[PDB]
Design a protein around this nucleic acid. Structure first.
Ligand SMILES: Nc1ccn([C@@H]2O[C@H](COP(=O)(O)OP(=O)(O)OP(=O)(O)O)[C@@H](O)[C@H]2O)c(=O)n1
Ligand SMILES: [Mg+2]
Lengths: 733, 486, 746
RNA sequence: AGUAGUAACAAGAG
RNA sequence: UAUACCUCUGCUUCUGCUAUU
RNA sequence: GAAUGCUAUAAUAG
């Protein structure tokens, strides 16, 4: 019977004609304004004001209540609280000693439900508690700055949907208009309501506690091979710049997160295996010792039914039934017939801009599925042909058609893109155009349907077409039909190609996705030299480091045997981050420049160290016998991943003054491992293959010759070269 | 329109660019070298390298600040009993009699058997704390009528020359002691190898600083500025004798209380954060003020007996100064512990960097050196115009000290100089990197740096050190002049 | 001896790598003293000093001295020029529009559709706003309330409709009112009977009296900006002036900024509004491309840039043109709505702070001269520097003690829009088809221009051109501060790039201290700062573990809560020590209860209360987490519990509601002064809201919406509650009759 | 005095 | 003036905008 | 094999 008291207090409050007029004039909207109304100017130096105010007699303010009165005025000659009432709380003020007293000799309150209320946190603890810590590793880590989930959620919803659910749980009456959402989380509402039922904790806290575990806290962080929230929460302990730490959390891990990471493992294995002779050998070697968090890759691939080409290649390589089962977020397919050729092309879209997308060629048939709705799809290069489906759930049917329409990449689908569609992120990062077009047309469907076109429904046995509203209609979507009606032993080549028992190939390592991405769970390689699956900068550094380490031998062996020490397992890994279409050309160049130093007396250890790694890929010379000439050697990754031939570069530069080599930021001393003649010995010689310095810049020869103009010279022809700003040199063939 | 406007705009409008050459980088703040300017004086709140703590070995468990200050003097009674003022140096505008009387009031009051450390508001203590020295507020009506009432000329920091004692402070504060001060509390037991690496790595970093002079000084500065702030709020309208106390542990693991001197706190009705509370410092010191006379114009010194420093009878002086602080400086004093972090981090960065190269924990390697790697060294300083190399620990300590001095001499002058000079430090690093740097108005860039250099000792010395280092770099550059030159 | 030199580290480690050692952030920040009038006057003078060659005229609205530099004579030298050329500003924006097609209308759409949804309460989240009713700064929420209460008296109820637009309509309408009337309180004595000798007691009661001001006096106050000095201005010698704006003009700035934000978010070279990791990513990606795109053989050069007098030089009339050009396809009303904010700024009036203090050393007398009475005393009585300042102020000064200031933006009022105008310069890229190409990043004034050309001599031709281009937009590049080097390293918003943005731990060091919220919070904050620094600002595990210790010390000394086993004497320590002895599970006790710190690198992110909960004593946790404890103030029994409780905010730090989650007593300086009366005004609104929250528990959580009376809402709810309480059987006939009878009276 | 530094505090108020 | 060797006060003696959210 | 966009009383930056 709290109702009476409130009404009785309203009568008291309404006797203050000032309060009366406030209540009568201030609108329910304006409550928000007058709630925040106060005298208190915002405390700008709280760190200070606290440190100061703690030295005062009575810094704290009690809330006027029978509990406040249970605190005594003084205890054993300690003034706990005063008579003077605070301006804010309109209750007695007290010293910090009051708290310490209450926590010691205060009344013992009922802490029932606490654990259920603050479960969110207790789980956060439970994950650390039931975790397993592996080994710390010291070595380069390329941290990528990406937007990640900070705290694991009970169930993810938009803030609006989330808030509406919390209202249904805590404040039923003041909910407003019932939304679809209400029914969608009916289980969670009842479940939470039944758990928070018996609690004395203030509803406003229970609100924010639910908000904490329904609203997504998603922010940018520097991450490395760990996106999963239950990893992100621990990110501080997971890695630094120059060290890594293996950490297995507790509780549970999602089959989807297990899958999406499992792909990256396979892709990373294949990407590296491609460079070695007998890729299958290395592919198998690594895969057997590849651990996804705590779960072996082989076990994971066996357990999970799904994944991409790479997963199937590695499955075959290990000896597991390859599942040509496929996903496109919500849509999930399985190939019956066809062969897909992914060509990157410049697609114009309805709003009127040009987006680069990987378009698939050939006529293919897939077993499309979406929830309880199933279907058979048929598509050709940027055109859906025929879509058979079942009449399951109305929205599940509605989604499958939109997913299949987008998946087909029909030029009609691209025409129906009206409004703002972001392919580029706020931080200038690439988002997957197909996975964003999928995500866009699931929100705005009526545009796609109208921008597609209709036709007469089929007049067959159990075939009866459906219109926009997903009802058995006369007009159906152009090439859509609704029906009442719902492996083979492979082998894998050493070069990684899945051949049928007949001969025709179904997949190859040339068909896997080139896009590296942050694995959801922690990927570990239980073989020594795990760095080989690392990033461009990691491989680059770990390689040059291993070159420096064994420079003593490697340099000597070079002065005895010519090509004996070009073939090294480190330089193999290093090749897998070289563009394959320049790999051979770079080796062709480098080996010539190296041999040019050895034979013509003109050495340069900093250059030797720089180029030696490139000399692994079988050489690729020009048709006229001479090698290709280069200024910079571009590597896989960002436009900063390149090695300059003449100068230094963001990956590699040498400081002669200090005799200090700088690799991806890390500084190494070449003191002791340097010849006496080198200092005065110019670089001009070890810059172009079959080219050596004659004198200094000759104005008669004119301007500085380009790579092309240099390559197109007859032996014993002079030329002007620039090594770096303010070092002109006169070089001859 | 842009073409049309640029076409008709005066050629006199341009960035007037020039390629930076080493010779263009002249020394900054040339006035610091002018001997005709006064020697920058010691203007810190407390003594640092010139300090002297009286050693009072405690039971190990603490007591009241009056009690320890009493028992500390009770041991060194020869000093405490010295009632005859043997004055050595006087501050131009100070009172020998009043100051000595005040010292004696402190000693007596802190020595007595009473509970209180309150001081009777005597004519001397009133002069010392600056009683009722604030001007009286009057109406603008009356103000305007009065012609003799005027807006005062802003008082400016006067120019000063380089002072050795600044260099000497760095040198001594940087060096190793037998005494650990830091009060670093407990931590959670280690589980993750990261924590085991961190803890083991701490043992090297923390100790290397804890066993250095700067640390003790920092801790003293903190623990004083705490009790001072606590008194300032609690005992607002009371003159109080706060003892300059600090706990120290020797190699053998014995807890010694260190009384460095007695301070008195004037009325502290501190409304604003900037609002000043006059604090009068009486500090023990072995340092003879006659030696570096231009260091102690702000101080008044009394010879108060002697002590055995080892085999030597060093004469004990008493440095008496009318000083002041405010809520902010007092708070920032308590937040001076974080000097450890700024220095520790910067070197842990190098440890972790070098660890990535060698592929193991290079902590133990960088300091001492292992079977594989010899120890890490750094270009540390000069010795009759010749560069000298120092230990990783030394290099660490030198920074930790620098970070303390960043607080102790922290003001508007430093903030400016530090920020503006950073701009030139980079222009140097470009010349070092050989990234042919360009400048548009170098003079204007210099003036912004040079206007900050006034009467801040750390600024004035940082200019000297900068100018010295710049010279040593400028030399190193020569090696690169002739490279790939045929 | 051997003389240490700390700069000799730079020999071993390069500047960028160890930049941390160049930030003295263990040292005290600069704070201001006394008056900001000097610092304010400087800006006022300098703004007009760069516009003086422009078109000067007298405003036939305010009656003020207005100066218009725009389309003025082009500069003869490199002294800061405000003389921007509309044509060139438009041409720049046209190129931007070509480079980013549809973006202007795409943003305008969003910015417009926002405004329509935007409520009035949006204004109640802007610290101290200038209140025209009292001519002092006040809390945003109050400064609004005063204006709404004032407006109602002039027949302006647009606020009540709830949307921002109709409230904004009332602001531009309020200018056309011949007089403006507002409440301002007056004290009244009144006999009150009390157990007293004389048999009563006199007490002063507040009374709202209706003050009036003229059309002009109001307009000036509407166009007014109050001025302070910027305190804790790091890495600078001399202080600077900052400006707070009127509740009238704060409305229209939100939308014009919101418009420029929408534009910025979708720009390649915009440093705002992206921040920290998001920014570092974007700039790292930007540098990578503009680096690699450099012509082979040609030289890529980065100009580490900074513009001088960003605020003073930029013109409102240019910002007006920007909105007009950006909203070209937007409907007539929204084109006009946007146009207001610049128009207010192009007639704005700068308040001159407190004044100047005059003293006699001989007499020991000091007195403050109010800004109105600056030219009361002969200027010989002021000091040299102030004399000149006042002399130069003279022609822009107003008798009421303010300064006309037509030119200039003033500190930070239009950051987003200025960033756009900056980007617009970077949008040109080339002049006269020369052998160079510029492109950079802009974040307010702070800019980093990349120039890819054939040789550094040509790059300089490009930079020199960019400089001349900026001069036509009112953008002056600092030749002193700004510098240039070959691409690979630069500095941008104190982010130092060296083949990749370096770690600078020193900058965010101050945040390691005890935050000053309370015990329960400052622990969480303290650990979260360490946790976050360990990630973002590259703090190694040793330094991280040390940071924990150094925090725990600061915490234990601040909240005087040393280990219960320790013998540190203290008032709280006496009871702490009794708790230490009384308690069995001592490892369960929180640090604040003299408990042991059990935080390490791994568990930084778990709340102390949640960590130890499992190993607490039942009595101790029963006390520590008492549901109805007096320190926090929960819900209730219904006596008359109505304190001045503020709205429970959603802070990012993770902490449990326990006895250590207390609140400090309010600064009572207000009890001495006449402002006293406001406490009753507060404790009124408090009573109204607090009761409303007893009717609607959802109000505490989510914003209640409705243009109807609060009383109306409260009444119906209580009626239903009572009826259904009777029908259900929670309430009796006797009580229900009383309920319907009492509710009847309303 | 001193703090401090382009202007303040060195208590303010009934 | 008087109470007043009393009483009250210690960011409120004007602390802004925009990002990191 | 992609996303999910936000919106503190601290601190930093301009
Ligand atoms: N506390 C601050 C600092 C900066 N700014 C904004 O950032 C701009 C750049 O500030 P800064 O570069 O420090 O100074 P300038 O305005 O360039 O002034 P100066 O000519 O003295 O360099 C200011 O104009 C203002 O718009 C601000 O609003 N508040
Ligand atoms: Mg500037």
């Amino acid at each position: 019977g709290m109702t009476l008291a409130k009404i009785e207090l309203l009568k008291q409050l309404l006797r203050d004609n000032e309060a009366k007029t406030v209540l009568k004039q201030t609108t329910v909207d304006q409550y928000n304004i007058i709630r925040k109304f106060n005298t208190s100017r915002i405390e700008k130096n709280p760190s200070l004001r606290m440190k100061w105010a703690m030295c005062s007699n009575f810094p704290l303010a009690l809330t006027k209540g029978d509990m406040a009165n249970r605190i005594p005025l003084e205890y054993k000659g300690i003034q706990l609280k005063t008579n003077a009432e605070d301006i804010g709380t309109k209750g007695q003020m007290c010293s910090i000693a009051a708290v310490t007293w209450w926590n010691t000799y205060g009344p013992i309150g009922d802490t029932e439900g606490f654990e259920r209320v603050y479960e969110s946190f207790f789980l956060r603890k439970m994950r650390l508690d039931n975790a397993t810590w592996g080994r710390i590793t010291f070595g380069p880590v390329e941290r990528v700055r990406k937007r990640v989930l900070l705290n694991p959620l009970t169930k993810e919803m938009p803030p609006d949907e989330a808030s509406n659910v919390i209202m249904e749980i805590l404040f039923p009456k003041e909910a407003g208009i019932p939304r679809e959402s209400t029914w969608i989380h009916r289980e969670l509402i009842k479940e939470k309501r039944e758990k928070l039922k018996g609690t004395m904790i203030t509803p406003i806290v229970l609100a924010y506690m639910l908000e904490r575990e329904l609203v997504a806290r998603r922010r940018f962080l520097p991450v490395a091979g760990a996106t999963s929230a239950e990893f992100i929460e621990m990110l501080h302990c997971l890695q630094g710049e120059n060290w890594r730490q293996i950490y297995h959390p507790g509780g549970n891990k999602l089959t989807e997160s297990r899958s999406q990471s499992m792909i990256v493992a396979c892709r990373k294995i294949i990407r590296r295996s491609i460079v070695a002779s007998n890729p299958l050998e290395l592919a198998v070697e690594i895969a057997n010792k590849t651990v996804i968090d705590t779960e072996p890759l082989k076990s994971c691939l066996a357990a999970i039914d799904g994944g991409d080409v790479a997963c199937d290649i590695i499955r075959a390589a290990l000896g597991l039934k390859i599942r040509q089962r496929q996903r496109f977020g919500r849509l999930e397919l399985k190939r019956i017939s066809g062969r897909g050729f992914k060509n990157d092309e410049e697609i114009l879209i309805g709003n009127g801009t040009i987006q680069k997308i990987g378009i698939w060629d050939g006529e293919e048939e897939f077993h499309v599925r979406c929830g309880e709705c199933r279907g058979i799809l048929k598509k050709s290069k940027m055109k859906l042909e025929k879509l058979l489906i079942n009449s399951a759930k109305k929205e599940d049917m509605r989604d499958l058609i939109i997913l299949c329409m987008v998946f087909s990449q029909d030029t009609r689908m691209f025409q129906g893109v009206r409004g703002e569609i972001n392919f580029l992120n706020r931080a200038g990062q690439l988002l997957s155009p197909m996975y964003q077009l999928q995500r866009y047309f699931l929100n705005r469907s009526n545009d796609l349907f109208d921008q597609w076109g209709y036709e007469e429904s089929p007049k067959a046995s159990e075939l009866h077409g459906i219109n926009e509203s997903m009802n058995a209609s006369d007009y159906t979507l152009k090439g859509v039909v609704v029906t009442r009606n719902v492996t083979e032993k492979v082998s894998i080549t050493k070069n990684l190609s899945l051949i049928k028992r007949t001969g025709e190939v179904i997949m190859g390592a040339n068909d896997v996705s080139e896009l590296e991405s942050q694995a959801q769970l922690m990927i570990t390689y239980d073989t020594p030299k795990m760095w080989e699956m690392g990033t461009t900068k990691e491989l680059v550094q770990n390689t040059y480091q291993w070159v420096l380490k064994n420079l003593v031998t490697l340099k000597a062996q070079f002065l005895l045997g010519k090509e004996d020490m070009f073939q090294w397992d480190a330089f193999e890994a290093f090749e897998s981050i070289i563009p394959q279409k320049m790999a051979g050309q770079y080796s062709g160049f480098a080996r010539a420049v190296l041999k040019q130093m050895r034979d013509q007396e003109v050495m340069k250890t900093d250059q030797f160290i720089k180029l030696l790694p490139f000399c692994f890929s079988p050489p690729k010379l020009r048709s006229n016998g001479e090698p290709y000439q280069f200024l910079k050697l571009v590597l896989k990754g960002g436009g900063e991943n390149f090695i300059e031939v003449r100068k230094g570069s963001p990956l590699f530069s040498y400081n002669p003054q200090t005799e200090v080599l700088t690799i991806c930021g890390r500084m190494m001393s070449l003191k002791g491992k340097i010849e006496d003649e080198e200092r005065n010995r110019s670089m001009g010689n070890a810059v172009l293959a079959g080219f050596l310095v004659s004198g200094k810049y000759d104005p008669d020869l004119g301007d500085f010759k380009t790579i092309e103009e240099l390559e197109k010279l007859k032996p014993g022809e002079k030329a002007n070269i620039l090594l770096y700003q303010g070092k002109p040199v006169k070089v001859v063939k | 329109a842009i073409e049309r406007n640029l076409a008709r705009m005066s050629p006199l409008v341009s960035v007037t660019p020039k390629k930076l050459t080493w010779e263009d980088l002249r020394p900054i703040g040339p006035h610091i070298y002018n001997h005709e300017l006064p020697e920058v004086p010691y203007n810190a709140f407390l003594l640092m390298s010139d300090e002297l703590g009286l050693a009072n070995m405690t039971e190990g468990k603490s007591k009241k600040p009056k009690t320890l200050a009493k028992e500390c003097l009770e041991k060194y009674s020869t000093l405490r009993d010295q009632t005859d003022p043997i004055l050595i140096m006087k501050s131009e505008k100070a009172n020998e009699n009043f100051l000595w009387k005040l010292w004696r009031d402190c000693v007596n009051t802190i020595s007595n058997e009473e509970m209180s450390n309150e001081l009777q508001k005597t004519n001397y203590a009133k002069w010392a704390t600056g009683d009722g020295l604030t001007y009286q507020k009057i109406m603008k009506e009356v103000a305007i009528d009065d012609e003799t009432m005027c807006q005062e000329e802003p008082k400016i920091p006067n120019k000063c020359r380089v002072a050795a004692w600044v260099q000497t402070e760095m040198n001594l504060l940087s060096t190793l002691t037998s005494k650990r001060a830091l009060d670093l509390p407990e931590i959670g037991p280690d589980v993750a190898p990261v924590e085991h690496v961190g803890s083991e790595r701490r043992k090297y970093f923390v100790n290397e600083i804890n066993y250095c002079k700067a640390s003790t000084v920092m801790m003293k500065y903190v623990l004083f500025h705490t009790s001072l702030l606590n008194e300032s709020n609690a005992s607002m309208g009371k003159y109080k004798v706060i003892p300059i106390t600090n706990r120290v542990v020797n190699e053998k693991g014995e807890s010694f209380d260190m009384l460095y001197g007695l301070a008195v706190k004037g009325q502290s009705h501190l409304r604003g954060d900037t609002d000043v509370v006059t604090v009068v410092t009486f500090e023990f010191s072995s340092t003879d003020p006659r030696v570096d006379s231009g260091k102690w114009p702000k101080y008044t010194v009394f010879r108060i007996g002697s002590l055995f420093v080892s085999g030597r009878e060093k004469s004990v002086y008493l440095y008496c100064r009318v000083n002041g602080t405010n809520k902010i400086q007092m708070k920032w004093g308590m937040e001076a512990r974080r000097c450890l972090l700024q220095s520790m981090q910067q070197m842990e960065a190098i440890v972790e960097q070098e660890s990535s190269i060698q592929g193991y924990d290079m902590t133990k390697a960088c300091f001492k050196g292992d079977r594989v790697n010899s120890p890490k060294t750094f270009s540390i300083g000069t010795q009759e115009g010749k560069l000298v190399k120092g230990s990783f620990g030394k290099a660490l300590r030198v920074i930790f000290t620098k970070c303390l001095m960043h607080y102790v001499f922290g003001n508007a002058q430093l903030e400016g100089f530090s920020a503006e000079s950073r701009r030139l430090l980079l222009l140097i690093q470009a010349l070092k990197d050989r990234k042919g740097p360009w400048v548009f108005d170098l003079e204007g860039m210099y003036s912004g740096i040079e206007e900050c250099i006034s009467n801040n000792p750390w600024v004035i010395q940082s200019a000297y050190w900068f100018n010295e280092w710049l010279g040593f770099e400028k030399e190193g550059s020569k090696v690169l002049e002739s490279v790939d030159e045929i | 001896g051997m003389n240490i030199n700390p700069y000799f580290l730079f020999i071993d480690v390069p500047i960028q790598a160890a930049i941390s050692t160049t930030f003295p952030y263990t040292g005290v920040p600069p704070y201001s003293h006394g008056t900001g009038t000097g610092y304010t006057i400087d800006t006022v003078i300098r703004t007009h000093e760069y516009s003086n060659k422009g078109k000067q005229y007298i405003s036939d609205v305010t009656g003020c001295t207005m100066v218009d530099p725009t389309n003025g004579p082009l500069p003869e030298d490199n002294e800061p020029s405000a003389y921007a050329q509309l044509d060139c500003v438009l041409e720049a924006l046209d190129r931007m529009d070509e480079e980013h097609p549809g973006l202007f209308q795409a943003a305008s759409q969003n910015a417009m559709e926002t405004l329509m949804v935007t409520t009035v309460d949006k204004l109640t989240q802007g610290r101290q706003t200038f209140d025209w009713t009292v001519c002092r700064n006040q809390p945003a929420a109050t400064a609004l309330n005063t204006t709404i209460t004032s407006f109602r008296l002039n027949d302006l109820n647009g606020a009540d409709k709830g949307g921002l637009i109709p409230f904004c309509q009332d602001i531009i309408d309020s200018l056309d009112r011949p007089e403006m009337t507002f409440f301002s309180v007056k004290n009244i004595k009144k006999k009150l009977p009390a157990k007293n000798r004389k048999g009563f007691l006199i007490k002063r009661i507040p009374m709202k009296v209706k003050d009036k001001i003229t059309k002009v006096e109001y307009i000036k106050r509407a166009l007014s900006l109050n001025t302070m000095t910027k305190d804790a201005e790091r890495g600078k010698l001399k202080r600077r002036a900052i400006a707070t704006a009127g509740i009238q003009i704060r409305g229209f700035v939100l939308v014009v900024e919101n418009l420029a934000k929408n534009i910025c978010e979708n720009l390649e070279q915009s440093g705002l509004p992206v921040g920290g990791n998001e920014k570092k990513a974007k700039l790292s990606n930007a540098v990578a491309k503009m680096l690699s795109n450099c012509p082979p053989g040609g030289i890529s050069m980065t100009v580490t840039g900074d513009n001088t007098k960003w605020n003073e030089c930029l013109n409102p009339r240019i910002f007006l043109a920007m909105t007009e050009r950006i909203t070209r396809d937007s409907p007539i009303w929204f084109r006009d709505f946007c146009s207001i904010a610049p128009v207010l700024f192009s007639n704005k009036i700068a308040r001159l702070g407190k004044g100047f203090m005059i003293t006699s050393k001989t007499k020991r007398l000091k007195a403050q001269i109010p800004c109105p009475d600056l030219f009361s005393i002969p200027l010989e009585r002021y000091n040299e520097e102030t004399r000149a300042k006042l002399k130069k102020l003279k022609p822009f000064f107003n008798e009421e003690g303010t300064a006309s200031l037509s030119p200039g933006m003033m500190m930070g009022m239009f950051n987003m829009l200025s960033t756009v105008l900056g980007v617009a310069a970077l949008g040109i890229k080339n002049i006269g088809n020369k052998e160079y190409l510029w492109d950079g990043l802009q974040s307010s004034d702070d800019f980093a221009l990349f120039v890819n050309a054939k040789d550094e001599e040509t790059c300089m031709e490009g930079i020199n051109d960019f400089y001349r281009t900026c001069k036509l937009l009112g953008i002056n590049m600092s030749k002193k501060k700004s510098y240039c080097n070959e691409t690979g390293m630069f500095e941008f918003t104190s982010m130092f790039y060296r083949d990749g943005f370096v770690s600078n731990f020193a900058m965010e060091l101050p945040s390691f201290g005890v935050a000053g919220v309370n015990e329960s919070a400052d622990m969480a904050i303290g650990m979260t700062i360490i946790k976050n620094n360990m990630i973002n600002n590259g703090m190694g595990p040793a330094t991280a573990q040390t940071a924990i210790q150094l925090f725990i010390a600061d915490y234990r000394y601040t909240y005087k809560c040393h280990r219960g086993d320790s013998k540190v004497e203290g008032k709280r320590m006496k009871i702490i020590k009794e708790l230490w002895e009384n308690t069995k599970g001592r490892d369960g006790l929180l640090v604040a209860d003299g408990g042991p710190n059990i935080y390490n690198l791994r568990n930084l992110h778990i709340p102390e209360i949640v960590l130890k909960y499992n190993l607490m004593d039942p009595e101790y946790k029963g006390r520590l987490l008492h549901p109805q404890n007096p320190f926090v103030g929960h819900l209730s029994k219904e006596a008359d519990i109505t304190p001045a409780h503020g709205p429970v905010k959603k802070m990012d730090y993770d902490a449990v509601s326990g006895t250590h989650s207390w609140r400090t007593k309010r600064n009572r300086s207000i009890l001495n002064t006449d402002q006293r009366n406001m406490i009753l005004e507060e404790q009124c609104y408090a009573k109204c809201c607090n009761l409303f929250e007893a009717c609607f528990n959802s109000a505490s959580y989510r914003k209640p919406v409705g243009q109807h009376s609060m009383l109306e809402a409260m009444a119906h709810r209580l009626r239903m509650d009572a009826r259904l309480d009777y029908e259900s059987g929670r309430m009796s006939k006797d009580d229900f009759e009383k309920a319907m009878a009492h509710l009847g009276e309303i």
